[PDB]
Amino acid sequence: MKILVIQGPNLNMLGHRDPRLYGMVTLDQIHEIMQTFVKQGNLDVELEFFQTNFEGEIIDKIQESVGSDYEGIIINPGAFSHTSIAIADAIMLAGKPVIEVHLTNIQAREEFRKNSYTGAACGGVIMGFGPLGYNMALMAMVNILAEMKAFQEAQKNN
Amino acid sequence: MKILVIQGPNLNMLGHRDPRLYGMVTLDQIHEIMQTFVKQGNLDVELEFFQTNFEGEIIDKIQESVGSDYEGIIINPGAFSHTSIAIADAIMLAGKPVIEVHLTNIQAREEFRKNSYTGAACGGVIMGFGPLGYNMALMAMVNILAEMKAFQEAQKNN
Amino acid sequence: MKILVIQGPNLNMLGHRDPRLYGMVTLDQIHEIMQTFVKQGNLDVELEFFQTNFEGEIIDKIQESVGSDYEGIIINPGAFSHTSIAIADAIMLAGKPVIEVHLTNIQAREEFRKNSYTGAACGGVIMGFGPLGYNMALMAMVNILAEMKAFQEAQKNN
Amino acid sequence: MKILVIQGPNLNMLGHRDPRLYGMVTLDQIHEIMQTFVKQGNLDVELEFFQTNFEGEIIDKIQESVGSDYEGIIINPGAFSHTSIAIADAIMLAGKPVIEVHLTNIQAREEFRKNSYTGAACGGVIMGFGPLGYNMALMAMVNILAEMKAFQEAQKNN
Amino acid sequence: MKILVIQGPNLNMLGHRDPRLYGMVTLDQIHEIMQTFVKQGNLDVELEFFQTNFEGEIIDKIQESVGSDYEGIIINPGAFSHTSIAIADAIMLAGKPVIEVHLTNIQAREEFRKNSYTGAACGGVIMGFGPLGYNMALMAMVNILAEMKAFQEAQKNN
Amino acid sequence: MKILVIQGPNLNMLGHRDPRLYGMVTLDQIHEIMQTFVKQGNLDVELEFFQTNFEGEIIDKIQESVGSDYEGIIINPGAFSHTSIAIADAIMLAGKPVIEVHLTNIQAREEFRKNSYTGAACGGVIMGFGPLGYNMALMAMVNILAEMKAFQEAQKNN
Amino acid sequence: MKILVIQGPNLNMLGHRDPRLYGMVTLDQIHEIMQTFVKQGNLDVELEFFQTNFEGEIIDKIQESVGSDYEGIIINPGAFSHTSIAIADAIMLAGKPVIEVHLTNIQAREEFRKNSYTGAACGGVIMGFGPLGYNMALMAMVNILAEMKAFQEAQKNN
Amino acid sequence: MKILVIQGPNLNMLGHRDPRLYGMVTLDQIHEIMQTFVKQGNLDVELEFFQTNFEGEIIDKIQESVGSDYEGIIINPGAFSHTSIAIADAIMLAGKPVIEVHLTNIQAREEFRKNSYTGAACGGVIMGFGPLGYNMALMAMVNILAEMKAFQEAQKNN
Amino acid sequence: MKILVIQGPNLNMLGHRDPRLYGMVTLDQIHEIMQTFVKQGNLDVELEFFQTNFEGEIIDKIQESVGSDYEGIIINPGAFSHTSIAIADAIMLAGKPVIEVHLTNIQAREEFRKNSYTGAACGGVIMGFGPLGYNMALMAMVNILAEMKAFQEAQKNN
Amino acid sequence: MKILVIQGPNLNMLGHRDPRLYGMVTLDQIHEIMQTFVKQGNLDVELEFFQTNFEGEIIDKIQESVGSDYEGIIINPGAFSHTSIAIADAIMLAGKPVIEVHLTNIQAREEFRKNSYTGAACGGVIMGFGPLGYNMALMAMVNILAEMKAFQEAQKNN
Amino acid sequence: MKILVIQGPNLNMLGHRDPRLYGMVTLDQIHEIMQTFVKQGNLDVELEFFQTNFEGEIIDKIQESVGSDYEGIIINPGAFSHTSIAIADAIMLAGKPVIEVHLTNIQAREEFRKNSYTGAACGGVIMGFGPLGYNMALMAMVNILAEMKAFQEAQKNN
Amino acid sequence: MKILVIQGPNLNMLGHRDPRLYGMVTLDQIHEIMQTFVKQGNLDVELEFFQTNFEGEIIDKIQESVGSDYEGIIINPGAFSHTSIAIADAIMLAGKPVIEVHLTNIQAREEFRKNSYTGAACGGVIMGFGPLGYNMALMAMVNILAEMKAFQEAQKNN
Numbered sequence A, B, C, D, E, F, G, H, I, J, K, L: 001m002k003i004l005v006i007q008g009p010n011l012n013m014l015g016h017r018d019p020r021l022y023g024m025v026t027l028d029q030i031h032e033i034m035q036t037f038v039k040q041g042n043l044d045v046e047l048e049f050f051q052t053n054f055e056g057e058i059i060d061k062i063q064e065s066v067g068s069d070y071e072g073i074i075i076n077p078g079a080f081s082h083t084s085i086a087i088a089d090a091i092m093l094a095g096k097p098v099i100e101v102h103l104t105n106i107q108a109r110e111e112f113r114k115n116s117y118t119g120a121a122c123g124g125v126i127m128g129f130g131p132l133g134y135n136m137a138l139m140a141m142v143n144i145l146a147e148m149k150a151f152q153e154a155q156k157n158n
């Protein structure tokens, strides 16, 4: 049950960014808490991490998810979420649950961060809760896949 | 540890609303799942429910939260979140964590639902995950109050 | 066959308003003409009157209409029709015909009166014909309920 | 007492249009119901029908109404009502009551149908009530001309 | 000579608000300075205080002013002044002087506070001078009522 | 204690302007009432008058105020208040209280008079109360300088 | 030397229009003054008159001007000048001087009359001077054709 | 198999238009190349030509196409494609394939030529390729009607 | 009968400006043609010339016109006509005819030259006809003053 | 005679996309029909296929076309055509014909798909005709290169 | 080789301005560094300094530069660069190189400072580098005049 | 002292671009002049060159600059400067001086080139001076690093 975790642009440079917005945490410490989260709450979910500063690498990655190994995607397209209609399109072609995560609250920053093309493609969006946002996405995700296979087989024997 | 749960306008009429947006669930069944959630995961949080079609009752309610009995607020101001700068102001004067919850994804509907004055005042915002959104708010909330009293007393003996 | 008649804000102060827009008539004289209208043309429609300066009282009232006693609503949300997406939402959840009435022509006044969130939810909208507008709504309404029970039972014995 | 009835553009093609908007009725069946309406309720009003796909034919027609034979106009300028300031101007120069009628609710369609230049020139506007809209215009019209000759002669012997 | 003093939304929570905008003063200390103001400068003006977080309570209150006991209104509709066309309408129907007061300078804050529907209905508007703003309104008001009864009777004996 | 009084453009032509907006008063009669105001209420404030149709003369004048002779400025930049970011900048560089005064209510006129670049730089803004507006500015001003020297020396002996 | 004079829409109904805008003059009295103008000042210019409420008749007419009989066009496209890019295109294809005339000042009316697609195609535009506007166009026109044949032959013998 | 070819406004004046946009070709030479095109590639398509400067003649023409003689329409509504919602409506009521053709590239000219109301109604749009655009429309059209009768009868024997 | 002729900004530098817009003529040659115009057609009008690059000098000049020596103003506020609401205000306070003249056609240049605050204050506006524009203003002006003294005394003996 | 065929973003995932927009066809089946098209109609054009989800790979590819092997480009920049001014710039630097192709009609979808920066750089644009669009581009292209070498050598022996 | 250095509005008050934007430097210290710059790097450029708070004095000054004594202009129109189309026009009529300098980065401040009418007229624009900006302009300028006289005479002997 | 020089998109194709904008120079000749610049003026600055058509390669490159080898960046993000908030973010996370360079004047081209997200992140911006712009950036840069190490150590021994 692979859960793809895609981080947008400058998310790797967390730590050099404003300590007033992203505090003092690295894209790794947050990746490991998602671990200590699925590690703690025994959830047979093997999650993979992928981060790029390319709009293209993200789209490709999304596209490789149509395989099977992957059953869901937690993504923070970052700054590309307000401009990338291409990533938004990719998020629609994937036949899997995609949850958008934003460390900061995009409603409370520059006017050009209020809108999310990508987030409007995903099923749900989370923003504002710092690194804690991905764990929330993890909860939500496991609860969705669960409730989707319970509807899938529920309408198989009928 | 009272957690105030405030539901905006037509949220009580869930069930008569489009089954394509809000499915088939009532504002009560969702209130009880928040129960079976705090009931299950033993969390000493006694949560209260309050719902109004008045912008005024919401503001008042928010204001009564400056008491002490309340330590956090999970709110879905509903349609008022795009117009009410007054509720947004109230959300700023309260000295407590407020998490905004939206059943639907406001990025994917009419243009006049994209912006949230209220949500930009809160710490974080959740949207799209149906009734499951409040449980996510519950997780987030307990994890915030916890991490706030661990910072509060952490800087008391120093 | 109760027909709820809901008047928005300052509609009670008709008489103190500009005699150039609303002439010299009170919200009562207009309520009684709707009477002398259903009184004259024998139509078994008992209509109720309700007026508030609250967006909330209107929404509640709309909501109580899901009962049965009420079979239709003639409403003039007044100034709230250009701002209230909440009343507009309520007008959609009600499973009954709602006709919007405006004494004045909202196309011919301040730019902020041209749009009607509420009116776009209702089945039809009437504006410009002074107090005569509600009688037109009455005609229309009786003609709609009639043509709805003729379609209802028409597809019951088949 | 000639009442000119002017139908805008594609209104003749009713029947080929979306059955979801204009149902299944022709510009004739609706013209005859306005008949069976004035025919039934004995009202000495001889109404004439005129329909064009030309903005020009409409303006001319409006202009010929300054004669005397005509005492009122029920019009549905259709798609020209959002663009034609020329028809709107004509509606102002005519010294007679003009009532604008729209089968559909122009508040609930494409953004470019919300505004009516023409409708803002007329005394009142009706929209949403299907073919029933013109009968409402007929009621309104007879009630206006009546109340205008009662004011005309009322201030003649004084 | 009753002067109604109406305070909009979160104005009661002054003290919990930003000390950088509203400093450290309560809606009461400011109400008493308006007292020590009319108390000091002997002005036979008995002023009443009324504050609500409801757009509706404000409109009602305004409406009750058509009595006689009241001869003027000093109001700070607060956040509702940028959205409430209903309160603006009420301010026009009242046949008495209304002066709008804003503690802060609405020209120097968020873009959505620049416009005042309500303030454009009142005779004058004051903003920026902290609690001192209402005393200025008091001066202005007494100077207006005075200059209005001097014009009223001045054109009574002629 | 020199208080500079700066009048913008066509303010000298008061008297030739619309009697419906500025009534029948000259820029002098209003200057003398500010006199009979400080003359009456014994306030050791010697106020100077300066009026120009130049954006430049105003800026210069503002700049000469950094002297000492001047302790405050009451200004009506007039039509330049909606366009002059240069006068607005000057109003920020001056280290003294500036109060903006408008005879008319700029919220109730042409759309291009609603915004005030200059007024958003000043501490407060007054509009609508005819010539009485400057006396209000005078009150406010003396009350501010007073409350500023009471804070100045209050934090000198400590 | 035929000068085509094209009048747009409702220009024939001059006389029924607002006496506050177009006074009391008919499209004929103004046509004859253009006569008594070329009649008086001996100018061998035979001018033709053409008026329509059709955007199409105007374009055609413009197109027939590529003949030879016509050497210039004085036009008032009226309300079509703000919407007709087609008439504007026609005004560009004609290889002759076109002068746009407006009785009223289109800068001082509804926002939708400020722009002129057609006028921006013509060489010059005149507005505000009532019927006197066409005589001004006549002067201008004769002075242009004159100065064009003096440049035409001036660069023929060289 | 009649294919109606409708040319909008000033398309007949091709030749007098800018040689930089439309080169040196007449609406006839282009009509004959569509001939030498269907003449060469043996395609039993008899195409008719119709051109007007009237928005009305175009709509009528479109409407007459509901006959049978016509099986498709290649149209260049020209300048009316950016303003005519009426022609756009007509293009929707016709139950036949309509292909929009533009000699020039409307994306590369004045801002008011970028949008096509009419083109958004048609199945496809072609622009930029000079007269060659209609031959492309011809190819496309024959390929569509062919693929439509192969789907029509393909689901007739089943 | 002094006619003030006011030239805005860079109008003195005519000759250094684009020969494609203003050709090859100086602000003097154009001033003398207005002379050879009133000189030729015997019109007892002594016209004065005034040109500045200051918005202030223009306003002052306008203001000095309330004298008597001046009976009309022909003005080209130039670039200030799109920004100067102050000059526009001055043009309203003057109790004399003001005609706005523009060498070029402001409808056919940069978007920021389309609107004229000043021109909307004047009685009429002329643009596009090169230096010939002022002579047209001269005709118009003499024809207006003439028709104003014929109305003035016409209603003096009655 | 290499014709480069560049496909933008998610065009490879055709088949997983909405069957209502892109039907049931893969980026390959469409590539082979362009083959069976040049294969059938004997046209010595060897076309190459290139598809990326990168804005960068597209620009590079475009740039490599300045070689010689390539004589034209048929491109569908997809979602990047509305945002990529960089690809638009590349399309201008290439000294070869570029034809833009869109499977769907970008005039009939989300507002952010109406504009094409890239398409406005190309010579022509095709949209709406499903996979058939590229064959149309092929026709057009061969007809352009042909007509370009007939102009090239036509002005070589002269 | 006189280089005119023109400083816009409040640039003389540098020192009283925000130390966070303009630091602690006076318009003189910066004028002398431009000296110690041309003084150090032996460049036969005698530069003159001119500063005004008048839009008019700037335009005049620009105009006097058409003399000869001046061979270039380094200017910081300051706040007038976003509003003054008149100064922008003057910058176009001058037949000399003009370089615009901004101490601060106008892209990073209030929305009304992003655009520069004046800067778009100049050859180049520099912003952000504090007082160092003018020295950069000096380098650039000497390098331009040099490269202009090397092109001037380079095409004189040919 | 490595100075990273990053060139955006189509900057490598300089030479094929419009000779009217970028003249006749290649991205290399300009790179070598930056050499002959640091080569001439003995400045121990070893500058590196990097150019891509990828938004991603640029961000990466920026990110690698947090090393130490690099002490500054001169960048021309080209067309990405108006759209890339991601590159703008990267420019903020780097703890080094970044100077934005534009060959052309982005204030004087298409509306979509006026704004620079990236340039508003950098310390300063240079535009308009052709290849000479980078040498100006070089001067500025060396002068900044110098003045930064003089402030760095200046506050180390204290």
Ligand SMILES: O=C1C[C@@](O)(C(=O)O)C[C@@H](O)[C@@H]1O
Residues within 6 Å of the ligand: A008, A010, A076, A077, A078, A079, A081, A101, A102, A103, A104, A105, A106, A113, A127, A128, L089
């Ligand atoms: O970099 C970021 C951070 C972000 O993705 C987030 O974590 O909330 C939100 C983005 O819009 C923003 O530009």
Ligand SMILES: O=C1C[C@@](O)(C(=O)O)C[C@@H](O)[C@@H]1O
Residues within 6 Å of the ligand: B008, B010, B076, B077, B078, B079, B081, B101, B102, B103, B104, B105, B106, B113, B127, B128, C089
């Ligand atoms: O009613 C609703 C539902 C909502 O609150 C939600 O649950 O997501 C969102 C609101 O914007 C909307 O109007």
Ligand SMILES: O=C1C[C@@](O)(C(=O)O)C[C@@H](O)[C@@H]1O
Residues within 6 Å of the ligand: C008, C010, C076, C077, C078, C079, C081, C101, C102, C103, C104, C105, C106, C113, C127, C128, E089
């Ligand atoms: O008050 C009114 C009256 C109104 O409801 C009407 O009766 O037409 C219309 C409202 O928009 C307006 O504000």
Ligand SMILES: O=C1C[C@@](O)(C(=O)O)C[C@@H](O)[C@@H]1O
Residues within 6 Å of the ligand: D008, D010, D076, D077, D078, D079, D081, D101, D102, D103, D104, D105, D106, D113, D127, D128, H089
């Ligand atoms: O065609 C129609 C129908 C319409 O006139 C109506 O009947 O409501 C409304 C028009 O805006 C629209 O385009």
Ligand SMILES: O=C1C[C@@](O)(C(=O)O)C[C@@H](O)[C@@H]1O
Residues within 6 Å of the ligand: B089, E008, E010, E076, E077, E078, E079, E081, E101, E102, E103, E104, E105, E106, E113, E127, E128
């Ligand atoms: O709360 C406030 C305070 C306010 O009323 C004032 O006191 O100035 C102004 C309002 O716009 C604002 O939202």
Ligand SMILES: O=C1C[C@@](O)(C(=O)O)C[C@@H](O)[C@@H]1O
Residues within 6 Å of the ligand: F008, F010, F076, F077, F078, F079, F081, F101, F102, F103, F104, F105, F106, F113, F127, F128, I089
């Ligand atoms: O002239 C005036 C008068 C004014 O300054 C005032 O007195 O209120 C306001 C200005 O905006 C306006 O243009």
Ligand SMILES: O=C1C[C@@](O)(C(=O)O)C[C@@H](O)[C@@H]1O
Residues within 6 Å of the ligand: D089, G008, G010, G076, G077, G078, G079, G081, G101, G102, G103, G104, G105, G106, G113, G127, G128
């Ligand atoms: O009808 C008219 C009159 C007009 O053409 C004129 O005469 O000035 C101007 C038009 O814009 C307007 O609609």
Ligand SMILES: O=C1C[C@@](O)(C(=O)O)C[C@@H](O)[C@@H]1O
Residues within 6 Å of the ligand: G089, H008, H010, H076, H077, H078, H079, H081, H101, H102, H103, H104, H105, H106, H113, H127, H128
């Ligand atoms: O006239 C024309 C020509 C045109 O139809 C074309 O052929 O491309 C496009 C129209 O927008 C334009 O106004």
Ligand SMILES: O=C1C[C@@](O)(C(=O)O)C[C@@H](O)[C@@H]1O
Residues within 6 Å of the ligand: I008, I010, I076, I077, I078, I079, I081, I101, I102, I103, I104, I105, I106, I113, I127, I128, K089
């Ligand atoms: O300079 C000019 C010339 C002008 O006044 C004219 O003569 O038409 C028009 C102005 O808008 C423009 O800026």
Ligand SMILES: O=C1C[C@@](O)(C(=O)O)C[C@@H](O)[C@@H]1O
Residues within 6 Å of the ligand: F089, K008, K010, K076, K077, K078, K079, K081, K101, K102, K103, K104, K105, K106, K113, K127, K128
């Ligand atoms: O005052 C200033 C300073 C400025 O000219 C500058 O030095 O960068 C920029 C101007 O826009 C601004 O208003």
Ligand SMILES: O=C1C[C@@](O)(C(=O)O)C[C@@H](O)[C@@H]1O
Residues within 6 Å of the ligand: J089, L008, L010, L076, L077, L078, L079, L081, L101, L102, L103, L104, L105, L106, L113, L127, L128
């Ligand atoms: O390509 C370019 C060139 C540019 O970077 C410059 O060199 O000035 C500016 C960019 O906006 C533009 O698209």
